[PDB]
């Protein structure tokens, strides 16, 4: 039975509002409701992997696993296997997979980050899971960020703490945070970004929602505007939103938004908002297509509606050659020409590079670059033709063209990374000098760029 080249992944996020779910939640897993919904002809086709994030979840892990497995069994007639479950306070992530995938999944990791300081520490944060699926690394983050329309900067700070401190994926990738450790990273949750309009426009906003006219609301969505200004979620994607705001509803109906300030809200308004989101980041030139992104209409126990998203995601095999793993393949090489890093740092130390990739036996350190000043004040670190020739473990182009090289630029003085990026080996040609480029980030913020040329030799 052949190994898959693509799988489908279900992501769900639901703030349950500390209430038990209703008896039937299958519309969630079927991507039915509002927005970009799944075709009815697919209803009996199971996704390969289901990743379920909850916030304000009142259930035990056992209780929620019961409900999830029974719901998927009812839909698909398949008994899913539990890959992982992890809970921080009332924030939870469950990963379920088809039983045929049990021996394709390995290296399962879980972690959590608590976001608060002093008073703020004690209910917000994130949980995550990572694993390998054959040759492909997958990461998943469910976060419950700070509440309140006035707190978008605190949400952005929560995001950066989660990014920095969530310990998932391959610990040998020591310069890299979760935003570079995975072929595909999915980050979802009750992110709590709000529609930033005046509170006296509440009834106008509800009218727009009833007309399914979201454009003038989305133009004020804090997550879209902060992402456009590069304040958060740099280099992530989100599908277009075509479903009504998922917060804040009166419970047991979806006919009414409960926006008014009350003692229970700390005298805050909750104007209708897209609190509940799914974003992703995949390595360059890997197949990833969003197939659905929407909200259910028939699950009403919470003041939030569940959100679903589904993806078709490219995956690769666990390649074995006569040579690697366990040795290099002399017929393969990776070479770099006319390369240089442009850094935003105001510092003047020497820099070197590290190249990290699963196609190498271990990471490779370059010689120091030569610092120059750019025309507009920048630090330019020139490597020219000085970068090492990388020796992949497998030369077969059906393996090597699917790989990626992670790059860190490190201070010689401190051995700290000043920037991380990723180069695809999915080239237009082999044995040909071709341009390469990545932005460089550190703690998820832009710190520079790396560009130059690559020349890849494969056994063809
Ligand atoms: Mg709540």
Short mmCIF file of C-alpha atoms and ligand atoms in Angstrom, two decimals:
data_model
loop_
_atom_site.label_atom_id
_atom_site.label_comp_id
_atom_site.label_asym_id
_atom_site.label_seq_id
_atom_site.Cartn_x
_atom_site.Cartn_y
_atom_site.Cartn_z
CA UNK A 1 0.00 0.00 0.00
CA UNK A 2 1.64 3.25 -1.22
CA UNK A 3 2.70 6.08 1.15
CA UNK A 4 0.59 9.22 0.76
CA UNK A 5 1.84 12.37 -1.04
CA UNK A 6 -1.00 14.46 0.46
CA UNK A 7 -3.22 14.27 3.52
CA UNK A 8 -6.16 16.29 4.74
CA UNK A 9 -6.12 17.94 8.16
CA UNK A 10 -9.11 19.23 10.13
CA UNK A 11 -8.50 22.10 12.55
CA UNK A 12 -11.21 23.10 14.99
CA UNK A 13 -11.26 25.87 17.59
CA UNK A 14 -14.08 26.33 20.10
CA UNK A 15 -14.33 28.46 23.23
CA UNK A 16 -16.98 26.39 25.10
CA UNK A 17 -17.79 29.16 27.62
CA UNK A 18 -17.41 26.68 30.55
CA UNK A 19 -20.56 24.80 29.48
CA UNK A 20 -20.91 21.19 28.39
CA UNK A 21 -21.47 20.70 24.65
CA UNK A 22 -24.83 19.74 23.17
CA UNK A 23 -25.62 16.10 22.25
CA UNK A 24 -24.63 16.51 18.55
CA UNK A 25 -21.55 18.42 17.35
CA UNK A 26 -21.03 16.59 14.00
CA UNK A 27 -21.65 19.82 11.95
CA UNK A 28 -18.28 21.05 13.31
CA UNK A 29 -16.28 18.09 11.98
CA UNK A 30 -18.25 18.20 8.68
CA UNK A 31 -17.36 21.89 8.04
CA UNK A 32 -21.07 22.83 7.80
CA UNK A 33 -22.54 26.23 8.65
CA UNK A 34 -21.43 29.64 7.44
CA UNK A 35 -18.34 30.60 5.47
CA UNK A 36 -16.32 28.39 3.12
CA UNK A 37 -18.00 25.05 3.78
CA UNK A 38 -17.26 21.46 2.73
CA UNK A 39 -19.22 19.79 -0.07
CA UNK A 40 -21.91 17.32 1.07
CA UNK A 41 -20.41 14.66 -1.25
CA UNK A 42 -17.37 14.46 1.11
CA UNK A 43 -19.34 13.88 4.36
CA UNK A 44 -18.38 10.20 4.73
CA UNK A 45 -14.70 10.76 3.74
CA UNK A 46 -12.59 10.98 6.89
CA UNK A 47 -9.82 13.57 7.24
CA UNK A 48 -6.45 11.96 7.94
CA UNK A 49 -5.84 14.01 11.11
CA UNK A 50 -8.30 15.93 13.33
CA UNK A 51 -6.84 18.60 15.66
CA UNK A 52 -9.35 20.00 18.15
CA UNK A 53 -8.56 23.10 20.22
CA UNK A 54 -10.86 24.19 23.02
CA UNK A 55 -10.82 27.11 25.43
CA UNK A 56 -12.93 27.53 28.59
CA UNK A 57 -13.35 23.70 28.34
CA UNK A 58 -15.16 22.38 31.45
CA UNK A 59 -14.80 18.66 30.59
CA UNK A 60 -12.24 16.12 31.72
CA UNK A 61 -9.89 14.81 29.03
CA UNK A 62 -11.71 11.47 29.26
CA UNK A 63 -15.15 13.11 28.85
CA UNK A 64 -14.08 15.17 25.81
CA UNK A 65 -12.20 12.25 24.15
CA UNK A 66 -15.42 10.15 24.51
CA UNK A 67 -17.48 12.81 22.75
CA UNK A 68 -14.92 13.44 19.97
CA UNK A 69 -14.27 9.78 19.12
CA UNK A 70 -18.01 8.94 19.12
CA UNK A 71 -18.78 11.97 16.88
CA UNK A 72 -16.13 10.96 14.31
CA UNK A 73 -17.25 7.29 14.48
CA UNK A 74 -20.84 8.39 13.74
CA UNK A 75 -19.71 10.47 10.71
CA UNK A 76 -17.10 8.17 9.17
CA UNK A 77 -17.63 4.67 10.70
CA UNK A 78 -13.86 4.86 11.60
CA UNK A 79 -12.55 4.50 15.18
CA UNK A 80 -9.81 7.17 15.37
CA UNK A 81 -6.59 6.71 17.37
CA UNK A 82 -5.55 9.27 19.98
CA UNK A 83 -2.19 10.77 18.95
CA UNK A 84 -1.92 13.27 21.81
CA UNK A 85 -3.95 15.30 24.29
CA UNK A 86 -2.62 18.21 26.38
CA UNK A 87 -4.44 20.58 28.71
CA UNK A 88 -3.30 23.81 30.45
CA UNK A 89 -6.04 25.01 32.83
CA UNK A 90 -9.14 25.03 30.57
CA UNK A 91 -7.17 25.24 27.24
CA UNK A 92 -6.90 21.88 25.50
CA UNK A 93 -5.65 20.27 22.31
CA UNK A 94 -6.62 16.79 21.05
CA UNK A 95 -5.02 15.13 17.99
CA UNK A 96 -6.80 12.14 16.45
CA UNK A 97 -5.67 10.18 13.40
CA UNK A 98 -6.92 7.37 11.16
CA UNK A 99 -5.75 3.97 12.52
CA UNK A 100 -3.80 3.34 9.23
CA UNK A 101 -1.53 6.29 10.21
CA UNK A 102 -0.46 4.93 13.61
CA UNK A 103 2.93 3.65 12.30
CA UNK A 104 3.47 6.78 10.12
CA UNK A 105 3.34 9.10 13.20
CA UNK A 106 6.33 9.43 15.55
CA UNK A 107 8.26 11.94 17.64
CA UNK A 108 5.12 13.15 19.42
CA UNK A 109 5.77 16.24 21.59
CA UNK A 110 3.44 18.33 23.74
CA UNK A 111 4.02 21.59 25.62
CA UNK A 112 2.28 24.63 27.05
CA UNK A 113 3.08 28.30 27.67
CA UNK A 114 1.44 30.38 30.43
CA UNK A 115 1.25 34.07 29.30
CA UNK A 116 0.44 36.15 32.37
CA UNK A 117 2.75 38.20 34.69
CA UNK A 118 1.63 38.54 38.38
CA UNK A 119 -2.19 39.26 38.15
CA UNK A 120 -2.43 38.28 34.41
CA UNK A 121 -0.79 34.79 34.99
CA UNK A 122 -3.40 32.12 35.77
CA UNK A 123 -5.76 31.44 32.86
CA UNK A 124 -4.38 32.49 29.35
CA UNK A 125 -1.73 30.77 27.29
CA UNK A 126 -1.29 28.02 24.76
CA UNK A 127 -0.97 24.29 24.34
CA UNK A 128 0.67 22.56 21.39
CA UNK A 129 1.46 19.23 19.79
CA UNK A 130 4.04 18.27 17.17
CA UNK A 131 4.93 15.00 15.44
CA UNK A 132 6.46 13.55 12.32
CA UNK A 133 4.11 12.12 9.67
CA UNK A 134 6.54 10.01 7.59
CA UNK A 135 9.07 12.61 6.27
CA UNK A 136 6.95 15.68 7.17
CA UNK A 137 7.01 17.60 10.47
CA UNK A 138 3.65 18.96 11.72
CA UNK A 139 3.03 21.48 14.49
CA UNK A 140 -0.21 22.65 16.09
CA UNK A 141 -0.79 25.48 18.56
CA UNK A 142 -4.06 26.25 20.36
CA UNK A 143 -3.87 29.61 22.14
CA UNK A 144 -6.33 31.52 24.34
CA UNK A 145 -5.03 35.12 24.26
CA UNK A 146 -5.90 38.09 26.48
CA UNK A 147 -9.54 39.29 26.28
CA UNK A 148 -10.88 42.80 25.71
CA UNK A 149 -11.02 45.22 22.78
CA UNK A 150 -8.46 47.52 24.56
CA UNK A 151 -5.78 44.78 24.82
CA UNK A 152 -4.52 44.15 21.24
CA UNK A 153 -0.91 44.94 22.26
CA UNK A 154 -1.12 42.41 25.14
CA UNK A 155 -2.40 39.80 22.63
CA UNK A 156 0.60 40.54 20.42
CA UNK A 157 2.88 40.11 23.47
CA UNK A 158 1.14 36.83 24.35
CA UNK A 159 1.78 35.64 20.75
CA UNK A 160 5.48 36.46 21.01
CA UNK A 161 5.84 34.65 24.37
CA UNK A 162 4.12 31.55 22.96
CA UNK A 163 6.30 31.66 19.80
CA UNK A 164 9.49 31.95 21.87
CA UNK A 165 8.80 29.52 24.70
CA UNK A 166 6.69 26.70 23.30
CA UNK A 167 9.12 23.77 23.08
CA UNK A 168 7.90 21.54 20.22
CA UNK A 169 9.65 19.79 17.34
CA UNK A 170 13.29 18.78 16.99
CA UNK A 171 15.35 20.15 19.96
CA UNK A 172 18.51 19.93 17.74
CA UNK A 173 17.05 22.91 15.81
CA UNK A 174 18.30 25.03 18.69
CA UNK A 175 18.40 28.52 16.95
CA UNK A 176 14.84 28.07 15.64
CA UNK A 177 11.50 28.75 17.28
CA UNK A 178 8.24 26.96 16.35
CA UNK A 179 7.76 29.33 13.35
CA UNK A 180 10.68 27.51 11.59
CA UNK A 181 10.61 23.95 13.05
CA UNK A 182 7.75 22.46 10.97
CA UNK A 183 6.93 21.76 7.35
CA UNK A 184 3.41 22.88 8.28
CA UNK A 185 2.50 24.87 11.43
CA UNK A 186 -1.17 25.50 12.30
CA UNK A 187 -1.87 28.19 14.94
CA UNK A 188 -5.46 28.58 16.03
CA UNK A 189 -7.57 29.43 19.03
CA UNK A 190 -9.55 32.11 20.75
CA UNK A 191 -7.10 34.78 19.74
CA UNK A 192 -9.55 37.44 21.05
CA UNK A 193 -8.84 40.16 18.45
CA UNK A 194 -11.88 42.41 18.08
CA UNK A 195 -13.68 44.58 15.52
CA UNK A 196 -12.41 48.02 16.55
CA UNK A 197 -15.39 50.31 15.93
CA UNK A 198 -17.05 52.76 18.34
CA UNK A 199 -19.28 51.09 20.92
CA UNK A 200 -22.25 53.28 19.88
CA UNK A 201 -22.04 51.55 16.42
CA UNK A 202 -23.07 48.18 18.02
CA UNK A 203 -26.54 48.08 16.40
CA UNK A 204 -25.07 49.19 13.02
CA UNK A 205 -22.57 46.31 13.26
CA UNK A 206 -25.36 43.79 13.99
CA UNK A 207 -27.33 45.14 10.97
CA UNK A 208 -24.28 44.60 8.72
CA UNK A 209 -23.93 41.03 10.03
CA UNK A 210 -27.62 40.29 9.34
CA UNK A 211 -27.03 41.50 5.74
CA UNK A 212 -23.90 39.25 5.49
CA UNK A 213 -21.94 42.44 4.66
CA UNK A 214 -18.64 41.89 6.44
CA UNK A 215 -16.24 44.15 4.48
CA UNK A 216 -16.59 47.30 6.68
CA UNK A 217 -16.20 45.10 9.77
CA UNK A 218 -13.18 43.11 8.53
CA UNK A 219 -11.42 46.40 7.66
CA UNK A 220 -11.47 47.10 11.46
CA UNK A 221 -10.58 43.54 12.60
CA UNK A 222 -7.56 43.96 14.88
CA UNK A 223 -5.86 40.73 13.78
CA UNK A 224 -6.02 41.72 10.08
CA UNK A 225 -4.85 45.26 10.82
CA UNK A 226 -2.03 44.19 13.21
CA UNK A 227 -0.89 41.56 10.68
CA UNK A 228 -0.93 44.18 7.85
CA UNK A 229 1.30 46.42 10.06
CA UNK A 230 3.64 43.42 10.78
CA UNK A 231 2.90 43.55 14.56
CA UNK A 232 1.91 39.87 14.91
CA UNK A 233 1.74 36.60 12.95
CA UNK A 234 4.44 37.69 10.48
CA UNK A 235 4.62 35.27 7.49
CA UNK A 236 1.44 33.39 8.44
CA UNK A 237 -1.60 32.92 6.18
CA UNK A 238 -5.31 33.02 6.91
CA UNK A 239 -8.14 32.17 4.51
CA UNK A 240 -10.62 34.95 3.73
CA UNK A 241 -13.35 35.25 6.37
CA UNK A 242 -16.84 34.81 4.89
CA UNK A 243 -18.72 33.80 8.09
CA UNK A 244 -20.36 36.03 10.70
CA UNK A 245 -18.47 37.07 13.84
CA UNK A 246 -18.27 34.09 16.21
CA UNK A 247 -18.50 36.13 19.46
CA UNK A 248 -20.37 37.19 21.59
CA UNK A 249 -23.72 35.34 21.30
CA UNK A 250 -26.55 34.86 23.74
CA UNK A 251 -26.49 31.13 24.62
CA UNK A 252 -29.09 28.62 23.23
CA UNK A 253 -29.74 30.74 20.09
CA UNK A 254 -27.58 32.32 17.35
CA UNK A 255 -30.21 35.02 16.71
CA UNK A 256 -28.67 37.55 19.14
CA UNK A 257 -25.31 39.12 19.86
CA UNK A 258 -24.80 40.02 23.56
CA UNK A 259 -22.52 43.05 23.30
CA UNK A 260 -23.62 45.35 26.18
CA UNK A 261 -21.38 45.99 29.19
CA UNK A 262 -22.37 44.03 32.34
CA UNK A 263 -20.78 43.28 35.71
CA UNK A 264 -19.95 39.77 34.36
CA UNK A 265 -17.85 41.41 31.56
CA UNK A 266 -16.05 43.80 33.94
CA UNK A 267 -18.17 46.62 32.44
CA UNK A 268 -16.62 45.99 28.98
CA UNK A 269 -18.48 45.97 25.70
CA UNK A 270 -18.07 42.90 23.49
CA UNK A 271 -18.87 44.23 20.04
CA UNK A 272 -19.32 41.31 17.58
CA UNK A 273 -15.86 39.99 16.69
CA UNK A 274 -13.94 37.25 14.94
CA UNK A 275 -12.26 36.02 18.12
CA UNK A 276 -11.85 32.41 16.90
CA UNK A 277 -9.28 31.91 14.13
CA UNK A 278 -7.08 29.49 12.21
CA UNK A 279 -3.77 30.55 10.66
CA UNK A 280 -0.92 28.55 9.15
CA UNK A 281 2.68 28.80 8.03
CA UNK A 282 4.27 26.20 5.75
CA UNK A 283 7.80 26.01 4.36
CA UNK A 284 8.27 27.63 0.94
CA UNK A 285 6.94 25.70 -2.09
CA UNK A 286 5.16 23.01 -0.05
CA UNK A 287 1.59 22.23 -1.11
CA UNK A 288 -0.96 23.58 1.37
CA UNK A 289 -4.51 24.53 0.33
CA UNK A 290 -7.34 25.65 2.62
CA UNK A 291 -10.47 23.61 1.67
CA UNK A 292 -12.88 25.11 4.27
CA UNK A 293 -12.96 27.94 6.79
CA UNK A 294 -16.20 28.71 8.59
CA UNK A 295 -18.35 28.51 11.69
CA UNK A 296 -21.17 26.20 12.76
CA UNK A 297 -24.73 27.55 13.08
CA UNK A 298 -26.30 24.76 15.23
CA UNK A 299 -23.99 24.48 18.28
CA UNK A 300 -25.30 27.06 20.76
CA UNK A 301 -24.15 26.05 24.30
CA UNK A 302 -21.38 28.70 24.32
CA UNK A 303 -21.20 32.47 23.75
CA UNK A 304 -18.77 31.56 20.92
CA UNK A 305 -19.52 29.48 17.84
CA UNK A 306 -17.08 26.71 16.85
CA UNK A 307 -14.76 27.43 13.91
CA UNK A 308 -13.50 24.83 11.44
CA UNK A 309 -10.77 24.87 8.82
CA UNK A 310 -9.56 22.04 6.61
CA UNK A 311 -6.38 21.71 4.56
CA UNK A 312 -4.83 19.55 1.88
CA UNK A 313 -1.17 19.31 2.95
CA UNK A 314 1.77 17.88 1.03
CA UNK A 315 3.72 15.12 2.81
CA UNK A 316 6.81 13.10 1.91
CA UNK A 317 8.03 9.55 2.52
CA UNK A 318 10.62 8.15 4.95
CA UNK A 319 13.34 7.84 2.29
CA UNK A 320 15.99 5.06 2.51
CA UNK A 321 18.82 4.82 -0.09
CA UNK A 322 21.76 2.34 -0.33
CA UNK A 323 23.84 5.28 1.11
CA UNK A 324 22.00 7.57 3.59
CA UNK A 325 20.65 7.54 6.17
CA UNK A 326 23.92 6.60 8.01
CA UNK A 327 26.30 8.11 5.41
CA UNK A 328 26.49 10.93 2.79
CA UNK A 329 25.62 10.40 -0.92
CA UNK A 330 28.70 11.61 -2.94
CA UNK A 331 26.40 12.27 -6.00
CA UNK A 332 24.58 15.12 -4.10
CA UNK A 333 25.85 18.63 -3.24
CA UNK A 334 24.42 22.05 -2.31
CA UNK A 335 26.49 25.18 -3.18
CA UNK A 336 26.00 28.96 -2.67
CA UNK A 337 27.24 31.95 -4.75
CA UNK A 338 27.03 35.79 -4.35
CA UNK A 339 25.35 35.42 -0.90
CA UNK A 340 24.94 38.02 1.83
CA UNK A 341 22.78 38.80 4.82
CA UNK A 342 21.31 42.27 5.32
CA UNK A 343 20.67 42.87 9.05
CA UNK A 344 18.72 45.55 10.92
CA UNK A 345 21.02 45.32 14.00
CA UNK A 346 22.76 48.53 15.16
CA UNK A 347 25.49 46.18 16.59
CA UNK A 348 29.04 45.63 15.15
CA UNK A 349 30.15 41.97 15.93
CA UNK A 350 31.26 39.33 13.39
CA UNK A 351 28.65 36.85 12.13
CA UNK A 352 28.65 33.26 10.83
CA UNK A 353 25.88 31.02 9.46
CA UNK A 354 24.50 27.68 10.52
CA UNK A 355 22.71 25.45 8.00
CA UNK A 356 20.24 22.94 9.50
CA UNK A 357 18.34 20.30 7.53
CA UNK A 358 17.12 16.72 7.86
CA UNK A 359 18.98 16.10 4.53
CA UNK A 360 22.35 16.66 6.40
CA UNK A 361 23.92 14.28 8.95
CA UNK A 362 24.29 17.31 11.27
CA UNK A 363 24.18 21.09 11.06
CA UNK A 364 27.01 22.97 9.33
CA UNK A 365 28.75 26.14 10.57
CA UNK A 366 30.22 28.62 8.01
CA UNK A 367 33.29 30.84 8.36
CA UNK A 368 32.61 34.42 9.46
CA UNK A 369 31.28 36.83 6.83
CA UNK A 370 32.80 40.24 6.07
CA UNK A 371 30.75 43.17 7.38
CA UNK A 372 30.09 46.14 5.02
CA UNK A 373 27.80 49.23 5.51
CA UNK A 374 24.82 49.37 3.06
CA UNK A 375 23.89 52.58 1.12
CA UNK A 376 20.95 53.34 3.53
CA UNK A 377 22.83 52.59 6.84
CA UNK A 378 22.30 48.75 6.98
CA UNK A 379 24.75 46.05 8.07
CA UNK A 380 25.60 43.81 5.10
CA UNK A 381 27.39 40.55 5.95
CA UNK A 382 29.07 39.26 2.78
CA UNK A 383 29.79 35.53 2.47
CA UNK A 384 30.58 35.92 -1.29
CA UNK A 385 31.72 32.47 -2.52
CA UNK A 386 33.01 31.44 0.96
CA UNK A 387 29.97 29.29 2.15
CA UNK A 388 30.63 25.52 2.65
CA UNK A 389 29.52 22.86 0.10
CA UNK A 390 26.69 20.92 1.90
CA UNK A 391 26.77 17.09 1.61
CA UNK A 392 23.24 15.61 1.65
CA UNK A 393 22.65 12.03 2.94
CA UNK A 394 20.59 11.14 -0.18
CA UNK A 395 21.24 12.42 -3.77
CA UNK A 396 17.98 11.10 -5.39
CA UNK A 397 16.23 14.24 -6.76
CA UNK A 398 12.80 12.84 -5.77
CA UNK A 399 14.06 13.21 -2.17
CA UNK A 400 16.39 16.21 -2.34
CA UNK A 401 14.15 18.65 -4.30
CA UNK A 402 11.51 18.23 -1.54
CA UNK A 403 13.90 19.32 1.25
CA UNK A 404 14.56 22.70 2.93
CA UNK A 405 17.61 24.37 4.49
CA UNK A 406 17.09 26.40 7.65
CA UNK A 407 19.61 29.25 8.07
CA UNK A 408 20.57 31.05 11.27
CA UNK A 409 22.96 34.03 11.30
CA UNK A 410 24.82 33.98 14.65
CA UNK A 411 27.06 36.43 16.45
CA UNK A 412 30.67 35.16 16.81
CA UNK A 413 30.82 37.03 20.19
CA UNK A 414 27.65 35.53 21.81
CA UNK A 415 26.75 32.51 19.53
CA UNK A 416 23.17 33.95 19.67
CA UNK A 417 21.01 33.97 16.51
CA UNK A 418 20.20 37.41 15.06
CA UNK A 419 17.95 35.95 12.34
CA UNK A 420 16.40 32.69 11.10
CA UNK A 421 15.03 31.80 7.68
CA UNK A 422 14.32 28.90 5.32
CA UNK A 423 15.34 28.05 1.70
CA UNK A 424 13.44 25.51 -0.43
CA UNK A 425 15.40 23.06 -2.62
CA UNK A 426 12.32 22.84 -4.94
CA UNK A 427 14.37 24.50 -7.69
CA UNK A 428 13.52 25.17 -11.35
CA UNK A 429 16.80 23.49 -12.42
CA UNK A 430 19.71 21.44 -11.06
CA UNK A 431 23.43 22.10 -11.80
CA UNK A 432 22.28 25.75 -12.55
CA UNK A 433 22.94 28.92 -10.51
CA UNK A 434 19.56 30.22 -9.34
CA UNK A 435 18.55 33.08 -7.06
CA UNK A 436 17.56 32.26 -3.44
CA UNK A 437 15.97 34.50 -0.83
CA UNK A 438 14.50 34.32 2.67
CA UNK A 439 13.48 36.98 5.13
CA UNK A 440 15.21 36.60 8.50
CA UNK A 441 13.28 36.81 11.78
CA UNK A 442 14.20 36.56 15.45
CA UNK A 443 11.47 36.02 18.08
CA UNK A 444 9.14 36.15 15.05
CA UNK A 445 10.07 39.82 14.23
CA UNK A 446 11.81 40.83 10.97
CA UNK A 447 15.55 41.33 11.52
CA UNK A 448 16.95 41.18 7.99
CA UNK A 449 17.21 39.18 4.78
CA UNK A 450 19.45 36.55 3.23
CA UNK A 451 19.91 36.31 -0.51
CA UNK A 452 22.31 34.87 -3.05
CA UNK A 453 22.46 32.01 -5.49
CA UNK A 454 22.25 28.22 -5.08
CA UNK A 455 23.57 25.41 -7.28
CA UNK A 456 22.10 21.95 -6.47
CA UNK A 457 23.54 18.66 -7.77
CA UNK A 458 21.30 15.54 -7.58
CA UNK A 459 22.00 12.01 -8.95
CA UNK A 460 20.22 13.24 -12.15
MG1 LIG B 1 -15.51 33.78 27.53
#
